[PDB]
């Protein structure tokens, strides 16, 4: 399945041999970095003035001439041909060259390559991936592995932009980049324009900018030095501040300085794109002249980033519409998916939807925001790949199989198996949420509505929780074990474990209430106490990060049917047997609404509480904000929202 899906395909049902010996025309005149993906592929082989005819070139080139009519008169468009007697390999421009090679490529399979013809070009202009999110920058070897990613598809932009990197924001955005770091971007940038992606760099200086000479030669100084290191786009990103760094105006002028006196004044200077500080519709003052200033002063060529509705959306024809009536041209889009940097416990493993697919003239460019985890993250940038180029066709779940058999084909249905059950965010803050679990949801929601009311419930929905399980549980461990792509496992190996823990718990409970007689209930019972345990103790010591630490899977409707079944047949058992067992679902090692333990955080879900030990008490905080702090006193109970402790 090629991806993304060209614009316009003709195929015929015959397929040809690849060229054993072949004669490469176009070969000096071309784009060198098609020519060398072409001449990588045509390996094994060799070129006379004997055998097949293969042309390669640019719409001018002599070698695509005969072609002229075909090139789509597009930027980045290609002509594609395959047919007996000669392929074709002619691009509207050189980066169109480069597609038509990416393209080419899918079509190559056990060295034979089907008859076809594609006319092709990408509905928006610039496409690709945003590092912006808060939390752990990606690695180098991570960012040298996107930018890979991003030429097989036909990605032409990334925007370096990590809130966490110091050179980036407040305050050494003032710095040059260390020896280090700056040979480290140096190599990004060469590995950026071999692939034809555009290394855009961003920075974010409004928190403690000055609106005076000396900040903002600063500010052009800090981007001549990315340019000694050969960047060639820019950006300037005013989004999450509060001051003066938030005047329209002024950001206007400093973006039409640096258009003027530095993006307009280099060779070869190619995006310039700014942030606003209202980047959302919901964060936006309707009633204030802030958007409506972008658009008046900012000079046109300049481009403006906008998230949607709110923070966190989906891009709407009525939302885009909204924007562009304001900034006066078609809105850049920041989409904050799958970024998970304020769901930082959750994993966002699920397609990409939502998005209109008939607004491409209305958007500039569009950018995803990804999770902290790079490799995690390539399912939906893969699946935003095959959107921004060809919205028309936008295929939300074939696309996402086809990212995950990319990714990992060595083991892509477990792949698929995992993502499947962990593409919901849980409650939030944005009020964002993805389905998930879908496949399963009819029969578990059976289950258990058939339960809770002494109905019997359907034999084969109880198969196929069960049939889930076990799925899970093969996919989770040939995953821990899977070394095609490393990274990718050291990724989500925590979630994994979890996974593991959640599909065991699933099929212990369901024994529970099959439940043959009372020794063997107890003893699933207490099995499943056990794996609760097991769960909690993954999710106070991995992911340990301050804001959403730990590890949740699974959580939209398996752990719920999970939970829920539990406590009915705790309830069922303790009637029936008059006994007390405890039917509570999430272990808790100390007593009090339940408990939540955070880091070295005890708390009461928003009279009193008994640790499990003796601890140095920090502090307590209460809201009805009320705050004692401890000082390291013992402490073991509490008595009358939350406790700090030294742990
Ligand atoms: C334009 C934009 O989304 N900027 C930031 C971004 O860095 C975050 O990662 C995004 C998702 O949490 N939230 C909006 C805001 O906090
Ligand atoms: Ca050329």
């Given at each position: 399945?090629?991806?993304?899906?060209?614009?316009?395909?003709?195929?015929?049902?015959?397929?040809?041999?690849?060229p054993?010996?072949?004669?490469?025309?176009?070969?000096?005149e071309?784009?060198?970095?098609?020519?060398?993906?072409?001449?990588?592929?045509?390996?094994?082989?060799?070129?006379?003035?004997?055998?097949?005819?293969?042309?390669?070139?640019?719409?001018?080139?002599?070698?695509?001439?005969?072609?002229?009519?075909?090139?789509?008169?597009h930027k980045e468009?290609?002509?594609?041909?395959?047919?007996?007697?000669?392929?074709?390999?002619?691009?509207?421009?050189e980066?169109?060259?480069?597609?038509?090679?990416?393209?080419?490529?899918?079509?190559?399979?056990?060295?034979?390559?089907?008859?076809?013809?594609?006319?092709?070009?990408?509905?928006?202009?610039?496409?690709?991936?945003?590092?912006?999110?808060?939390?752990?920058?990606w690695?180098?070897?991570?960012?040298?592995?996107?930018?890979?990613?991003?030429?097989?598809?036909?990605?032409?932009?990334?925007?370096?932009?990590?809130?966490?990197?110091?050179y980036?924001?407040?305050?050494?955005?003032?710095?040059?980049?260390?020896?280090?770091?700056?040979?480290?971007?140096?190599?990004?940038?060469?590995?950026?324009?071999?692939?034809?992606?555009?290394?855009?760099?961003?920075?974010?200086?409004?928190?403690?900018?000055?609106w005076?000479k000396?900040?903002?030669?600063?500010?052009?100084?800090?981007?001549?030095k990315?340019?000694?290191?050969?960047?060639?786009?820019?950006?300037?990103?005013?989004?999450?501040?509060?001051?003066?760094?938030?005047?329209?105006?002024?950001?206007?002028?400093?973006?039409?300085?640096?258009?003027?006196?530095?993006?307009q004044?280099?060779?070869?200077?190619?995006?310039?794109?700014?942030?606003?500080?209202?980047?959302?519709?919901?964060?936006?003052?309707?009633?204030?002249?802030?958007?409506?200033?972008?658009?008046?002063?900012?000079?046109?060529?300049?481009?403006?980033m906008?998230?949607?509705?709110?923070?966190?959306?989906?891009?709407?024809?009525?939302?885009?519409?909204?924007?562009?009536?304001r900034?006066?041209?078609?809105?850049?889009?920041?989409w904050?998916?799958?970024?998970?940097?304020?769901?930082?416990?959750?994993?966002?493993?699920?397609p990409?939807?939502?998005?209109?697919?008939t607004?491409?003239?209305?958007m500039?460019?569009?950018?995803?925001?990804?999770?902290?985890?790079?490799?995690?993250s390539?399912?939906?940038?893969?699946?935003?790949?095959?959107?921004?180029?060809?919205?028309?066709?936008?295929?939300?779940?074939?696309?996402?199989?086809?990212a995950?058999?990319?990714?990992?084909?060595s083991?892509?249905?477990?792949?698929?198996?995992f993502?499947?059950?962990?593409?919901?965010?849980?409650?939030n803050?944005?009020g964002?949420?993805?389905?998930?679990?879908?496949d399963?949801?009819?029969?578990?929601?059976?289950?258990?509505?058939?339960?809770?009311?002494?109905?019997?419930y359907?034999?084969?929905?109880?198969?196929?929780?069960?049939?889930?399980?076990?799925?899970?549980?093969?996919?989770?461990?040939?995953?821990?074990?899977?070394?095609?792509?490393?990274?990718?496992?050291?990724?989500?190996?925590?979630?994994?474990?979890?996974?593991?823990?959640?599909?065991?718990?699933?099929?212990?409970?369901?024994?529970?209430?099959?439940?043959?007689?009372?020794?063997?209930?107890?003893?699933?019972?207490?099995?499943?106490?056990?794996?609760?345990?097991?769960?909690?103790?993954?999710?106070?010591?991995?992911?340990?990060?301050?804001?959403?630490?730990?590890?949740?899977?699974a959580?939209?409707?398996?752990?719920?049917?999970?939970?829920?079944?539990?406590?009915?047949?705790?309830?069922?058992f303790?009637?029936?047997?008059?006994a007390?067992?405890?039917?509570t679902?999430?272990?808790?090692?100390?007593?009090?609404?339940?408990?939540?333990?955070?880091?070295?955080?005890?708390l009461?879900?928003?009279?009193?509480?008994?640790?499990?030990?003796?601890?140095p008490?920090?502090?307590?905080?209460?809201?009805?904000?009320?705050?004692?702090?401890?000082?390291?006193?013992?402490?073991?109970?509490?008595?009358?929202?939350?406790?700090?402790?030294?742990?």
């Amino acid at each position: 399945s090629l991806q993304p899906p060209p614009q316009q395909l003709i195929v015929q049902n015959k397929t040809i041999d690849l060229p054993a010996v072949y004669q490469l025309n176009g070969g000096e005149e071309a784009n060198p970095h098609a020519v060398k993906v072409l001449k990588e592929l045509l390996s094994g082989k060799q070129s006379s003035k004997k055998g097949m005819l293969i042309s390669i070139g640019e719409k001018g080139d002599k070698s695509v001439r005969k072609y002229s009519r075909q090139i789509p008169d597009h930027k980045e468009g290609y002509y594609l041909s395959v047919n007996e007697k000669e392929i074709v390999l002619a691009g509207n421009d050189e980066r169109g060259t480069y597609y038509a090679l990416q393209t080419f490529a899918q079509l190559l399979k056990d060295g034979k390559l089907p008859e076809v013809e594609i006319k092709d070009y990408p509905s928006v202009r610039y496409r690709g991936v945003v590092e912006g999110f808060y939390g752990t920058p990606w690695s180098h070897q991570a960012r040298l592995s996107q930018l890979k990613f991003y030429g097989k598809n036909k990605m032409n932009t990334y925007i370096y932009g990590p809130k966490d990197d110091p050179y980036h924001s407040a305050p050494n955005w003032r710095l040059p980049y260390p020896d280090k770091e700056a040979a480290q971007l140096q190599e990004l940038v060469a590995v950026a324009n071999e692939n034809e992606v555009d290394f855009v760099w961003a920075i974010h200086p409004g928190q403690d900018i000055k609106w005076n000479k000396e900040d903002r030669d600063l500010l052009l100084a800090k981007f001549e030095k990315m340019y000694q290191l050969g960047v060639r786009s820019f950006a300037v990103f005013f989004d999450d501040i509060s001051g003066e760094g938030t005047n329209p105006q002024k950001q206007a002028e400093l973006l039409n300085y640096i258009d003027e006196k530095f993006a307009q004044v280099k060779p070869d200077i190619n995006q310039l794109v700014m942030c606003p500080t209202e980047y959302n519709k919901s964060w936006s003052n309707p009633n204030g002249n802030y958007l409506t200033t972008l658009g008046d002063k900012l000079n046109p060529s300049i481009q403006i980033m906008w998230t949607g509705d709110r923070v966190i959306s989906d891009i709407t024809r009525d939302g885009i519409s909204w924007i562009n009536e304001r900034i006066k041209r078609p809105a850049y889009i920041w989409w904050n998916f799958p970024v998970s940097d304020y769901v930082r416990d959750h994993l966002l493993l699920g397609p990409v939807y939502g998005n209109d697919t008939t607004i491409a003239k209305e958007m500039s460019g569009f950018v995803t925001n990804p999770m902290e985890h790079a490799e995690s993250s390539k399912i939906a940038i893969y699946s935003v790949a095959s959107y921004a180029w060809n919205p028309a066709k936008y295929d939300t779940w074939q696309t996402w199989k086809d990212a995950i058999r990319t990714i990992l084909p060595s083991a892509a249905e477990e792949l698929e198996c995992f993502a499947m059950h962990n593409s919901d965010l849980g409650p939030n803050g944005h009020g964002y949420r993805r389905e998930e679990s879908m496949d399963i949801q009819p029969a578990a929601e059976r289950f258990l509505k058939a339960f809770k009311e002494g109905k019997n419930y359907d034999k084969a929905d109880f198969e196929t929780l069960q049939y889930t399980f076990e799925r899970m549980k093969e996919s989770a461990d040939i995953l821990l074990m899977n070394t095609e792509n490393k990274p990718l496992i050291v990724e989500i190996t925590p979630w994994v474990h979890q996974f593991k823990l959640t599909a065991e718990m699933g099929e212990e409970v369901l024994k529970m209430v099959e439940g043959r007689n009372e020794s063997y209930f107890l003893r699933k019972y207490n099995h499943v106490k056990a794996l609760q345990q097991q769960m909690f103790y993954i999710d106070q010591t991995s992911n340990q990060n301050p804001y959403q630490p730990g590890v949740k899977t699974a959580t939209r409707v398996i752990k719920p049917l999970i939970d829920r079944t539990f406590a009915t047949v705790v309830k069922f058992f303790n009637q029936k047997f008059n006994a007390h067992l405890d039917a509570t679902t999430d272990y808790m090692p100390h007593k009090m609404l339940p408990l939540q333990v955070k880091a070295n955080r005890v708390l009461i879900s928003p009279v009193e509480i008994e640790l499990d030990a003796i601890y140095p008490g920090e502090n307590i905080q209460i809201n009805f904000r009320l705050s004692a702090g401890l000082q390291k006193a013992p402490v073991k109970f509490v008595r009358f929202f939350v406790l700090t402790i030294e742990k």
